[PDB]
Amino acid sequence: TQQPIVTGTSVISMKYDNGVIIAADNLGSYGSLLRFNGVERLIPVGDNTVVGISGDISDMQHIERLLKDLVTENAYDNPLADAEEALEPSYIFEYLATVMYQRRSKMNPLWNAIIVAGVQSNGDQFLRYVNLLGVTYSSPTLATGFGAHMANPLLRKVVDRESDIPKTTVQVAEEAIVNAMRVLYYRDARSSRNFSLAIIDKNTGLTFKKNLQVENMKWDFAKDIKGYGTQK
Amino acid sequence: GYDRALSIFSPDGHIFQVEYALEAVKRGTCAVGVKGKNCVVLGCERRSTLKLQDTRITPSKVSKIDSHVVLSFSGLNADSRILIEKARVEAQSHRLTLEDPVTVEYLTRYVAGVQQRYTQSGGVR
Amino acid sequence: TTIVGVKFNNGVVIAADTRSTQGPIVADKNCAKLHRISPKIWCAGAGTAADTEAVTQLIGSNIELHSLYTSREPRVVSALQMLKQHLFKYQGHIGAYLIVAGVDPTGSHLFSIHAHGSTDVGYYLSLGSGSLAAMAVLESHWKQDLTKEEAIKLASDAIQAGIWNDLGSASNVDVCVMEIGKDAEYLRNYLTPNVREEKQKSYKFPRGTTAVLKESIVNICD
Amino acid sequence: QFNPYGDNGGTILGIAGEDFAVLAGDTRNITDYSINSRYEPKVFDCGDNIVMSANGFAADGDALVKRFKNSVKWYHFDHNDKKLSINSAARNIQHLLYGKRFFPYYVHTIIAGLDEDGKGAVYSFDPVGSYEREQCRAGGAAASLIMPFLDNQVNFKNQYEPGTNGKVKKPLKYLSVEEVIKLVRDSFTSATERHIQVGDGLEILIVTKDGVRKEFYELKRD
Amino acid sequence: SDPSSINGGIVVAMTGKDCVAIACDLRLGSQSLGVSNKFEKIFHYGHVFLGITGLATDVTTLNEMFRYKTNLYKLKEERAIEPETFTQLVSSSLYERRFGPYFVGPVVAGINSKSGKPFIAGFDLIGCIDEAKDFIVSGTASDQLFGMCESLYEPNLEPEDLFETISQALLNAADRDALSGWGAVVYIIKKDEVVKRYLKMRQD
Amino acid sequence: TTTLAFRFQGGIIVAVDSRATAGNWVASQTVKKVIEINPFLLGTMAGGAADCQFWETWLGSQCRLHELREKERISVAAASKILSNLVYQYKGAGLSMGTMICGYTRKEGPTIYYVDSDGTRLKGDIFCVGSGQTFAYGVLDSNYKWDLSVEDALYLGKRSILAAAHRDAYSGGSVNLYHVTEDGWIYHGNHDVGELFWKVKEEEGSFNNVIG
Amino acid sequence: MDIILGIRVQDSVILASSKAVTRGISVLKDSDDKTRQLSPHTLMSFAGEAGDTVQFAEYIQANIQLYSIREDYELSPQAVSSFVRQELAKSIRSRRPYQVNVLIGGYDKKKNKPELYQIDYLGTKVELPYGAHGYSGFYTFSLLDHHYRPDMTTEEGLDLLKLCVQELEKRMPMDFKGVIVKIVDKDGIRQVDDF
Amino acid sequence: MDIILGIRVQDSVILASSKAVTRGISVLKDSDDKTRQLSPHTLMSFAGEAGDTVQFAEYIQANIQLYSIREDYELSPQAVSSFVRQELAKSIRSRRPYQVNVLIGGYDKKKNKPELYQIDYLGTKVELPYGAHGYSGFYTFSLLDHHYRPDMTTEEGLDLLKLCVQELEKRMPMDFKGVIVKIVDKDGIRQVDDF
Amino acid sequence: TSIMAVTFKDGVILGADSRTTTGAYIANRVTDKLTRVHDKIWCCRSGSAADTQAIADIVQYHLELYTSQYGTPSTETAASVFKELCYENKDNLTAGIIVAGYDDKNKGEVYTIPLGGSVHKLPYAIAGSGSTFIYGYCDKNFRENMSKEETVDFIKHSLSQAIKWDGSSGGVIRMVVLTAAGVERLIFYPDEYEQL
Amino acid sequence: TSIMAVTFKDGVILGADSRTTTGAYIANRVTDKLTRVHDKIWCCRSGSAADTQAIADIVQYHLELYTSQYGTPSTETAASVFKELCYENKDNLTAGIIVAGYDDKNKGEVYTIPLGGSVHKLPYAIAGSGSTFIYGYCDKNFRENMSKEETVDFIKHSLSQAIKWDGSSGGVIRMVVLTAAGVERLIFYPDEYEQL
Ligand SMILES: [Mg+2]
Ligand SMILES: [Mg+2]
Ligand SMILES: [Mg+2]
Ligand SMILES: [Mg+2]
Ligand SMILES: [Mg+2]
């Protein structure tokens, strides 16, 4: 048993017709102190998987090393490590999910909420969640922390059920994700303007975008707001 | 720990350490058991090569395992004490858990089991 | 519960869902959560249900008496000031959280009020367990100088976000529109789901199924 | 302090017919007032004509199903591909559960299938392994809402034959698979209306001598 | 310890076509111990019926209080109180004990003598009105009652059909509650006749 | 819960209720609170359901191994002590068990041992365990005799559970009856308390306080 | 205090109350009368917290005696029981509640009927054919449920009461030092001096 | 368990132990023998936590019986008591201590003297002319301090014991259902079947 | 919350962020924490919003009644009324208030009233959760008798950093300028102050 | 405690105060919080003195054994060893450590290891109770590729303010300069830095 110290907020994601998108801001908070501003919380595994992690950053860095070690280990005595016997999103998730549930069962959890996003060998989209309790679930849209409360409602307006996925393009999906990140910046006190976004497409592969910023913000209406009731 | 297999099979299918243990029994003083209609008698030989012995305190050849069962033996005297102690402990353990004293057959089966165990355990004769 | 308030060019609109729960159990599928303080000052609340209703009626009562005394139509700042001072006095033991909206001779207003007695001003506000689902929709689409039509749409879309995504929010959408210089128009069940459930069975029993020991006429007349 | 447990909501229902058995459950997964998934399967085909659901804390539920499926695999390996009977599976699950008696699987487990005489069978477990063969058993969030209805409509409790006035009970006539599926759908439709954790979808697994079949029905999403 | 579940018991009310029904179990207990099988929880003031579940001392106290208040109401108003008006009186009376409440779950049932409209209403222990068209439930088996009522209920039932529906709702709900049962009473209420029926049920 | 067991001329009568509750919620009315350890030995369920089920099933496995090894029926004394010694090892860990181990052997005759999760092992003639034990004891104590017939003894045990099922909120559902003889136990059926109550009331004239 | 029982038969009400007074470690008295006569045909037995029991009982006694003098009339048992219930219901939300449980046994001279009321410290009133407080009912109700008849004589009620006390003396852990038994009928209140 | 008394007279040791076994609300048994014979001339009575009492007693009994067989000799009461004290002293710093208090009454055949040892669950041993555990001594020691004589007969010890039990039955709140009395002398151990 | 008040040559300027949080949720991102208790006496509020609003409303009432009887009150008088409420009700309040005002006789004045109800007259004052991160910056960069533009820059830069590090602070930067010329409201948006 | 490490053109400089408190009592006013784990790899310690001394001693041991086998370790390697101890024993440690070192290949590097056991490579780092007060100042005044004299001034000014506001910080300002030229120790007394 512990308590999280340096933490990362929401990770948000969704499926679209040819793949998945995932995003997370670049902040590492120390309680109410916005201590670290250059933290990458999206960690790619090969060219077909991206693992987005929220929660305790020290545990994230540990998981990051486990994934790095997983790639090394898979390459051992494996002539098809860059082909048929390459790591799949489903392999990477199941491994993490096993670790997370084992850790909670020893009453020593990895204080995280994780979303594994990727594309399988057969082109199928993969998107599944796991947290410190070892709880797992899948959905067309997935989000952690504040994103679960604010991002999911917005993303579910685009893909409300399974049948909406083929109808959703990457431009529409990315647009919805980018808007959700803006909304979270407005309303989450532990968020930052800077974020990373990753797209895993079955045709164009893995596109990793760093140093993105929340833009087109509405603040002008603040000038007219005066007092808290009677003040003019 | 010392794990050496002392009791092993020979080409002719004999375990010599067990057979040589019988030769130790052959050397031991004679013991005899006879059961009547309403009694059992245990007779034991005392070799008279040892006089000046104190018969009050010298270990007697027949030992009570419980108030209703006795054990006599032929062979190594020191070895017999280990079996007698184990049998006595088991007799009390039986009374404690089953709430009934051991049958003569049960006590025999236990002692015999200990003897067998020492014929296929490592590091023991 | 999901409640929103949205300001527009010449008025204000307040909206709410209609689910009323006892914990995880639903008691009323069509609760009217939109209330009156005065004819053109409406409110809706979350928290302790009896406290939101009781505090609305009490201030509404005094607002009426005040309006009569002063020969003036009641102001939203008056409902606001009377509410917060009452709630503050009780240090949040009256679990009343409200969104208060209305028009008066001064203009159109939108306030949120919290159990401990703090108030807020805004052009769009949300409240209840569905507050975050609603605010996500409001932060995505609210703009300055909305028309009455746009503001009703934004408000009811914000409630829908709560209905679908919040377990404590469900069923229908109630709306009340307070435009300046007009009568406030209250739109009960402004949105309903189309379609109606039909069960596989009818459970209507055969008569005489229940066993009975006694019968008697109850004298209800004097 | 770290809480190793959680509640993912959900409601499941197992009914044993004369020559069949069903095990149903909603497809909604939740924490607190949020929806995690509208479709997250909860009832599983575990092989050898056995269906299983472990409702409550989904991490423990997934672990237990995973371990039992594994136990079926090793039962075949160890006993010449012998078919694991429903009664043997039940006793096996008791041991899986009781092995964690002092750090339990926070779940209410139900399995369904056919016994060795071809008759329908449902077994119900508590979190630490106590079990019983039953005819009808609801588990999870809305179990208290469903079971009284089932006592009334499956076992005809409190129902007497008209004209006799409580002297003759309603006879217990056998129900068909189609009749049972109606009671299941109506049970979940009612539960969805009055319980906030129940909704989204209903997946039923039917077990006969011909094998395992699935049926899916939508539920309200609010 | 929990005051609302020391004595046990349940009340349910339903609306039908030109009629209302209200029903209750007869148990009073001290936790596990059954004390009385004749503790009726439904009372009436004129043509307005009030069922009360919860802590039995408060049930008795509130009955006496509402008899008190409806009697004075009648003397002054020169007419019997109506269900809608009484509902507000119950709400008012409960909320005046906001920070020292009666541990009860009241249920009002009746027909307006002037409009002929059937009426039911429920309250939490501090007066929040639940104003539902179909049915109102209360007591230690309220979950069970919600389940029964949601599935068994259909609108516009005739008086004698409504009797069967509400009776089966109560009975089967009570049989899944340890602290409810030991007998049951059902009131069928029409504009100018009320029938009271005692049900036969298991006594465990 | 209400369970009882008593010794008499014809052996042992075992009678239990069938109700299981989780708070006020009645989880089941069809619970088997008599565990058939083997064809000669019975155990009652009270306290923890899993604890009683699991360890009394395990007890049957130990009794079976005993008679394989010793070629003789296990005594009720020895069987009961296997269970009491086991739970005593777990003492403090949180097992919950209140059971009567009932049997009829040659050397002992009809024998009952109350075994309990804090290590208690008591031999006796009459035992009653559960939330409704006090109600059952009253009927038992005032009507018990050694020279009861098997028929009258069965009824007494049935009537004593009924008494408890009526007054105790957490007891009821149905009554399960068993008669333990030297040649093994004999099941004497499941009796719905609902139907039993009215039947007994009429035939016996008891429960005048209740209207029927 | 500990055991207080009551049984209403054909023509009378019988109250049985334990004699022991225990203060922690020692039994200070074995002849305590846990009852007060409220009026010639109304008797109240009591049990609960030390001090509060007698204070409450004597307070009720005084109020009923005052009423009897003012009106030159004996209140009905039902009226007395309703008065007592209100006092206890009032008490439960007080600064320091009376922790007292009572049984009221009276003979209504107007209706010519015995009546037994059971009221707990919360103000929970019930009219019964037989009643008790504390754990007393747990041991005795199964016997009363079996043997009770509404047409029992006073002698039959006493015999059934003996059976109840015998079961209490067998299965109760505490020594309550026997019971004092009193009968309430049309002729008033009298104590059975041999029990 | 509850009351265990002991008194050493001229030529014997008398142990009196209550018969009741109470599990919370009900008295489950009224004929329980809270004693074990450790050897022909040594008896141990016990009281304490449920389960631990009998488990400890039977464990001691087995160990002494084992010693008796191995050496064909009966240990002196003093030796048996020292063994028991060590086991309890060992137990008190264990993971889960035996919560058992004992009295050891024995006749030393070598010295031709009766001996009574009192040992509590901590391993606190004392040799006494008379002893008890729990609250038993609070009621009885004033009577024993007054009447006791080291030259008392067995019959006089039994009469003094009756007086002690009578005082316990009067002032103790709990019903301990009488006592089983056993005498330990040169001829061994016997039970007084009428007390 | 990040609030400050700074005296300068021509008077005094109050500054504040606009973020109001309930845990990690931003309940209001456009809050006005600069409140008017008299024409040229304003305050910056920190702590319980309910408490600081209630206090400010009472003070505004007291100064309105004061003005009706004795004419325009001094900034010191306003601070005293604040202090009296905060000190006497210290057990039931969580309020940290900075009082700033302009007289013609006294010019710009700043009073800070921390949790206990003590009063401290200062050249400038900082308060709120975000103030902790700018004690060093403000101490190094403050000068007496700055110009209006320098003081606006000083406050803008200071609160920019407070917002940068404190998650409880954010939104826009509001300011109120108090001089002989009158009362001027200023607002600065994220895209302006974040790039400083 | 007030500690910091700053990279500059020629390498890196560590800085620290010298105050060690037991409650409000200053148990040591001349503490050396700049500790050497290798020739040109030093660290700044914050948190439990017992824990940070124990950790530093173990690290010094590990790097000594590393050097005997594999030659001079990198600053990254030193940080990893620190992290490994801090992360794996996070339940039983209260340590906040800044690691600074000079390679010829990598030049000046700074790693901060906060409470949880995470590692963060930064241009400069601040830590300790007094760091809170200089987040604003340090962010505004830090530049990359400063000169030795500029970096000394930056650290001197920064810790001067941290000491000014934090009661847990004080005494002298110690500094250690790590360059290709070698290792230089600096000390600055109160009469020097208080007047800045
Ligand atoms: Mg729902
Ligand atoms: Mg919803
Ligand atoms: Mg019931
Ligand atoms: Mg019952
Ligand atoms: Mg910020």
Numbering used by the authors:
A (entry chain a): 1 to 232
B (entry chain Q): 1 to 125
C (entry chain H), D (entry chain Z): 1 to 222
E (entry chain I): 1 to 204
F (entry chain Y): 1 to 212
G (entry chain J), H (entry chain X): 1 to 195
I (entry chain N), J (entry chain b): 1 to 196
Show sentences the authors wrote.
The pup1G170A-ProA-H7 mutant yCP was purified by affinity chromatography and crystallised after tag removal by Tobacco Etch Virus (TEV) protease. To avoid steric clashes, the guanidine group of Arg19 (yβ2) and the carboxylate of Asp190 (yβ6′) are shifted by up to 1.6 Å. Hereby, the hydrogen bonds between Arg19NH2 and Asp190OD2 (WT: 3.1 Å; mt: 5.1 Å) as well as Arg19NH2 and the C-terminus of subunit yβ6 (WT: 3.1 Å; mt: 4.5 Å) are broken. Furthermore, slight backbone distortions around the mutation shorten the distance between Ser171O and Pro192CD from 3.5 Å to 2.9 Å. This close contact leads to a flip of Pro192 out of the hydrophobic pocket provided by Ile163, Trp164, Val173 and Leu190 of yβ2, however, without changing its trans conformation.
The heart of each 26S proteasome is the 20S core particle (CP), consisting of seven different α- and seven different β-subunits, arranged in a cylindrical complex of four stacked rings following an α1–7β1–7β1–7α1–7 stoichiometry. The proteolytically active sites reside in the β1-, β2-, and β5-subunits and are buried on the inner side of the protease.
